[PDB]
């Protein structure tokens, strides 16, 4: 797996024509508060390509 290239799958906002996301936040997947901690309903925007 070449895990050098990634893709922001985890994001709620749709992007505007030519927009570049580069943030490293904890994607909240629901109402469960993430509070800067990775886990259930708390994943990460980027998804490494296999």
């Amino acid at each position, epitope marked *: 797996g070449n*895990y050098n290239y990634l893709y922001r799958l985890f994001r709620k906002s749709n992007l505007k024509p030519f927009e570049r996301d580069i943030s*490293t936040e904890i994607y909240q997947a629901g109402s469960t508060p993430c509070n800067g*901690v990775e886990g259930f309903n708390c994943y990460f925007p980027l998804q490494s390509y296999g």
Partner: antibody
């Protein structure tokens, strides 16, 4: 996921060495890394940590200046600079990745996956 | 520095029995954001550790259900529901709050 640690062997008191942590099976591009040592029968003790893209070079007192760390984000490898090695660093060295990839998941904190370890012996 | 002491130094417990391992921090490890930054490790004999308990009370991926953590502020306890023959080895705690990362001294759960 594999954490292959390379290098290591018998080095001279005061000599030099450099260690390689070749990682695969995961991103490593947004993950922090840790270096952990264990002198024979003396317990896990910390050495080093690095951020997602280097720059953040975090060391213990006993490795102040004397050790430095680096990563090859293209080739997905971790490195470790050594100089003037004393007898207290004779140990097996583990490179370990942080759990995770967000902030407040401290780059010097939880260590999810560990390697197999290579022995670094300082003697004559 | 955060110097952490484990209790007790050894817990030889027969398999099938329950076991608790306690490690108390010198300082307060609570609420960097609202959690308890103490992590629990098991170094099984001859091989490398992996995480057992993170954030004081929670566990990582794939851990046996028998493990659980408890305690807040300075006192923290690991709670093994049922010791078995694969549980042998040293247990470590770590403070995950300040940059000098200190581990425990190592208490083995063994079979006596």
């Amino acid at each position: 996921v594999q954490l292959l640690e390379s290098g290591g062997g018998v080095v001279q008191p005061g000599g030099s060495l450099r260690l390689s942590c070749a990682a695969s099976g995961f991103a490593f591009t947004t993950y922090a890394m840790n270096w952990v040592r264990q002198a024979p029968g003396r317990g896990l003790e910390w050495v080093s940590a690095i951020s997602d893209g280097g720059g953040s070079a975090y060391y213990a007192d006993s490795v102040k200046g004397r050790f430095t760390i680096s990563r090859d984000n293209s080739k997905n490898t971790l490195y470790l600079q050594m100089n003037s090695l004393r007898a207290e660093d004779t140990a097996v060295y583990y490179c370990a990745k942080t759990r995770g990839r967000g902030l407040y998941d401290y780059v010097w904190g939880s260590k999810d996956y560990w390697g197999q370890g290579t022995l670094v012996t300082v003697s004559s | 520095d955060i110097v952490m002491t484990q209790s007790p130094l050894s817990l030889p417990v027969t398999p099938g029995e329950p076991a608790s391992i306690s490690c108390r921090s010198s300082q307060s490890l609570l609420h960097s954001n609202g959690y308890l930054y103490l992590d629990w490790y098991l170094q099984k004999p001859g091989q490398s550790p992996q995480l057992l308990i993170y954030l004081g009370s929670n566990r990582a991926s794939g851990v046996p259900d028998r493990f659980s953590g408890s305690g807040s502020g300075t006192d923290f306890t690991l709670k093994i529901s049922r010791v078995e023959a694969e549980d042998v080895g040293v247990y470590y705690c770590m403070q995950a709050l300040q940059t000098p990362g200190t581990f425990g001294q190592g208490t083995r759960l063994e079979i006596k």
